[PDB]
Design an enzyme around this catalytic site. Structure first.
Site, short mmCIF file in Angstrom:
data_model
loop_
_atom_site.label_atom_id
_atom_site.label_comp_id
_atom_site.label_asym_id
_atom_site.label_seq_id
_atom_site.Cartn_x
_atom_site.Cartn_y
_atom_site.Cartn_z
CE1 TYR A 275 -1.30 5.12 8.21
CE2 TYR A 275 -1.61 7.46 7.79
CZ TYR A 275 -1.39 6.41 8.67
OH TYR A 275 -1.27 6.67 10.02
CG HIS B 49 -0.31 0.59 2.46
ND1 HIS B 49 -0.09 1.94 2.63
CD2 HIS B 49 0.17 0.00 3.58
CE1 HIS B 49 0.50 2.15 3.79
NE2 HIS B 49 0.67 0.99 4.39
CB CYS B 50 1.44 4.04 -1.88
SG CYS B 50 0.28 3.76 -3.23
CD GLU B 51 -0.84 10.69 0.48
OE1 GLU B 51 0.13 10.95 -0.25
OE2 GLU B 51 -1.58 11.57 0.96
#
Lengths: 171, 171
Positions: A139, A99-101
């Site tokens: 996130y 996952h990233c932002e």
């Protein structure tokens, strides 16, 4: 059909999934991420790694508990494949979650890269990490719904004004 | 038709809108919020108030610049209607923008409440605040895209674990 089969075609994906952008990847919801973090799959899943693909300053401002920060491909490859994270029980599964932002670009990308390197150092079907997922929404969607599973319990966007240099430095 | 007309049916809504949950309300994007904050409508809009309808602890953890925190209906009514914020130029508009964390509940309700009170103390078409919008996505969507327009430049979700009592107290 084979749609539910993991990397080595040995079995179906364990976690429930949701619709995501990239069709070649499997996505999970914040809710499923919490179930995993709270041990609801402890008898089946031996180990799981949460790979935060955001840049260091983003990660440092607040990330999911136990997540590791691997923004660069060399970091990810080194941490995950230099010394493969095998199960304490060859009967149990090892799962990776990226996952990233927003889990739109950096996350999915790192996920494909690792699958490539994994194929490269194995005998075709066999993979060190046959089962991988993308945390849908990243996130941004996870933090507001389950801040209690984040630390520090904050959020520093990639666009944060006080880290503009660190941003292009990392680009 | 009258759907594109503001409260007193005197003219059309000034800002571009986007699809939102509640059909009776007008929604604006984070992008439009920024245009307004940076003066792109300074010649037409005389004054605008951003009403953060979240609870105090959420607001204190990071809100949009210039926004006022009015969680309770009495606070909102008092601040906006006890002494009507009138325009410095009769040709110019006064605009209100409501939002909460996700802008699906607290904000839209406060927006409807104020419209009721406004109707109550006026001669039918006329209103002190004929033009009101909802910031689509609330702070959750605005903060990550434009953190530089927030202060402190952070985010404290309603669910923040260290504030469970204050949430109850405000419930």
């Amino acid at each position: 059909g084979i749609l539910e089969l993991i990397g080595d075609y040995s079995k179906a994906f364990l976690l429930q999934t949701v619709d995501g952008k990239h069709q070649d990847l499997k996505y999970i919801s914040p809710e499923t991420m919490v179930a995993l973090l709270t041990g609801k799959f402890s008898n089946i899943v031996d180990k799981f790694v949460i790979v935060d693909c955001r840049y260091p300053y983003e990660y440092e401002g607040g990330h999911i508990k136990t997540a590791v920060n691997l923004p660069l491909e060399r970091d990810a490859e080194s941490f995950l494949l230099k010394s493969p994270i095998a199960p304490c029980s060859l009967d149990k599964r090892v799962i990776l979650i990226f996952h990233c932002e927003f889990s739109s670009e950096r996350g999915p990308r790192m996920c494909r890269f690792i699958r490539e390197r994994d194929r490269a150092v194995n005998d075709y079907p066999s993979l060190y990490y046959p089962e991988m997922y993308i945390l849908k929404g990243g996130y941004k969607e996870f933090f507001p719904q389950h801040p209690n599973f984040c630390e520090p319990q904050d959020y520093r966007p990639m666009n944060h004004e006080a880290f503009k240099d660190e941003l292009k430095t990392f680009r």
